[PDB]
Design an enzyme around this catalytic site. Sequence first.
Site, mmCIF file in Angstrom:
data_model
loop_
_atom_site.group_PDB
_atom_site.id
_atom_site.type_symbol
_atom_site.label_atom_id
_atom_site.label_comp_id
_atom_site.label_asym_id
_atom_site.label_seq_id
_atom_site.Cartn_x
_atom_site.Cartn_y
_atom_site.Cartn_z
ATOM 1 N N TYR A 47 -5.756 10.197 -1.498
ATOM 2 C CA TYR A 47 -6.317 11.021 -2.537
ATOM 3 C C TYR A 47 -7.685 11.617 -1.697
ATOM 4 O O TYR A 47 -8.366 10.766 -1.329
ATOM 5 C CB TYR A 47 -6.634 11.040 -3.650
ATOM 6 C CG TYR A 47 -5.459 11.013 -4.735
ATOM 7 C CD1 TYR A 47 -4.752 9.847 -4.709
ATOM 8 C CD2 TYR A 47 -5.195 11.941 -5.540
ATOM 9 C CE1 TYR A 47 -3.643 9.662 -5.590
ATOM 10 C CE2 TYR A 47 -3.911 11.794 -6.450
ATOM 11 C CZ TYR A 47 -3.359 10.712 -6.325
ATOM 12 O OH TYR A 47 -2.166 10.650 -7.164
ATOM 13 N N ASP B 63 -2.632 14.792 -12.977
ATOM 14 C CA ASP B 63 -3.034 15.243 -14.360
ATOM 15 C C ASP B 63 -3.593 16.710 -14.194
ATOM 16 O O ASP B 63 -3.567 17.386 -13.268
ATOM 17 C CB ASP B 63 -4.245 14.332 -14.545
ATOM 18 C CG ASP B 63 -3.755 12.832 -14.831
ATOM 19 O OD1 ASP B 63 -2.664 12.605 -15.351
ATOM 20 O OD2 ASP B 63 -4.502 11.957 -14.397
ATOM 21 N N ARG C 162 -10.421 9.190 -10.295
ATOM 22 C CA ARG C 162 -11.751 9.843 -10.784
ATOM 23 C C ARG C 162 -12.705 8.849 -11.738
ATOM 24 O O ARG C 162 -13.798 9.019 -11.637
ATOM 25 C CB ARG C 162 -11.376 10.781 -11.972
ATOM 26 C CG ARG C 162 -10.645 12.035 -11.328
ATOM 27 C CD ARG C 162 -9.478 12.761 -12.238
ATOM 28 N NE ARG C 162 -10.357 13.372 -13.259
ATOM 29 C CZ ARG C 162 -9.610 13.981 -14.468
ATOM 30 N NH1 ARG C 162 -8.353 14.066 -14.217
ATOM 31 N NH2 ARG C 162 -10.249 14.114 -15.356
ATOM 32 N N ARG D 140 2.589 11.717 -10.162
ATOM 33 C CA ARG D 140 2.220 12.701 -10.905
ATOM 34 C C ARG D 140 0.804 13.004 -10.799
ATOM 35 O O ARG D 140 -0.016 11.990 -10.823
ATOM 36 C CB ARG D 140 2.635 12.082 -12.379
ATOM 37 C CG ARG D 140 2.676 12.786 -13.508
ATOM 38 C CD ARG D 140 2.715 11.980 -14.727
ATOM 39 N NE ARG D 140 2.635 12.772 -15.951
ATOM 40 C CZ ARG D 140 2.442 12.050 -17.258
ATOM 41 N NH1 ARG D 140 2.485 10.923 -17.326
ATOM 42 N NH2 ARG D 140 2.495 13.205 -18.274
HETATM 43 CL CL LIG Z 1 -7.525 9.818 -11.106
#
Ligand SMILES: [Cl-]
Lengths: 264, 264
Positions: B112, B54, B199, B52
């Site tokens: 990522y 954000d 992040r 999932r």
């Molecule tokens: Cl993140």
Amino acid sequence: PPVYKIALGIEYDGSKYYGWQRQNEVRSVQEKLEKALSQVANEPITVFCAGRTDAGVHGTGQVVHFETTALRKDAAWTLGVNANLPGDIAVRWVKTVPDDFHARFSATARRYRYIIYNHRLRPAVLSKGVTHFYEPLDAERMHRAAQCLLGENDFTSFRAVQCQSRTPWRNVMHINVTRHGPYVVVDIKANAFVHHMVRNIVGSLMEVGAHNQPESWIAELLAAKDRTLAAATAKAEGLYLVAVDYPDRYDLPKPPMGPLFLAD
Amino acid sequence: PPVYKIALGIEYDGSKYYGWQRQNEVRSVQEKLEKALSQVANEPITVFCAGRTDAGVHGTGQVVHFETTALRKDAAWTLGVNANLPGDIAVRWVKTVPDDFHARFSATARRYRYIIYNHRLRPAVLSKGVTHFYEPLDAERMHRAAQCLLGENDFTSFRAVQCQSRTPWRNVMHINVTRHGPYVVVDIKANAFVHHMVRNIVGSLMEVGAHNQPESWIAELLAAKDRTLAAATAKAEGLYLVAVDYPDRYDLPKPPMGPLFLAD
Ligand SMILES: [Cl-]
Ligand SMILES: [Cl-]
């Protein structure tokens, strides 16, 4: 008091605008830039651009000039204008220039990059900043086919019926077609362009790359001088204005062309 | 009649959605994809994602699975589905899979890429797909400082308070930081991530890269077990889910990860 003449490098995502040029019918890049500059300057500001771009076309190397009675630090014209602009337009740099500078008339060449995403299925990332082309493209064949466009040439076969110039002759200084993963990029530089010359040229290189036309077809179209024989104009969304040449006496900044991760 | 289980590779620009999951959100990627698949299947479809994402976060390598009673050719699950989706979401491929496949539970790792635009002035092209960081960054320093994150580690200092996982322990398979012109790219792969782990790691890495914190800081925060000591969470705009690992027996497609021009 003195009237200052200032040059700016402008970048923009052109997808939410109806071209560069301001007019009373639709939203433009120029109108937003003028509103932001007027806020900083505390007076109405009018900008003049190196090359007007059509609806949907983007810029990384656009240059404008403007005059103002406002004396300000470089921060005003960069951080200050950017704080007043929408997120899809930005100043890249500011340079005060002599009175004889003109963003259009001082320029001697313009360069564009055209970004094609080549796959059966359309892309979702940067969907309005790349042109989707469905059938497979041979980038090396497009490259070799484009080299005949170099130099002084009659671009009647790549000229739109709406162009008002009285001559179709222009000088292409370079042309390159390269593949980057699933992308095919056309890089073209000329002294000046007839109406829709870049997208007309890309549209025909695309038919050559898909093997709908031979490698010699561009030489053939050039020689045959008839725009009805050439491919439809390529879509606007993959086109970027990436550099404008000016005499070295103006000492204007030359930051990366891009778009995004491409090298100079 | 059979029930078929199908996997799809999904790409999306996350900027106009409030994340992947439809639960508790008006605007989600999952809702759009399930509407599109339900129209092609002529029955209500539910999809299950590998990871999932954000609000604001993008995907090039997302994978889903769903079950259907509809027997369709691969074109219906790709061109058909894309015809029923908005321009900022797209199917990249379709593969029928065994009954034992699950887009989440069969995956062994997620990867990522986080794209930083590191000029003083903000960008305009891809403005919601890159993170602008105005202080100059030392990418090599960031790279070196990140390597203490490799392997099994307690990621408490990089975990958001909303994370409900038992253990904060995860396995970082690789982490690299490289500069590409004015961009800085963080590439990180782990078996799975705790909430805001990517992040949060990038936020602290940018402080190290800007010379605001020492090169040892990532290891010091790792050992401290207190997220309140670490930097603010980096913005969503630059984050992309670029790949998910599955056992070779599933023989799933592995198209270019990007985003855009970045090589694999
Ligand atoms: Cl993140
Ligand atoms: Cl054009």
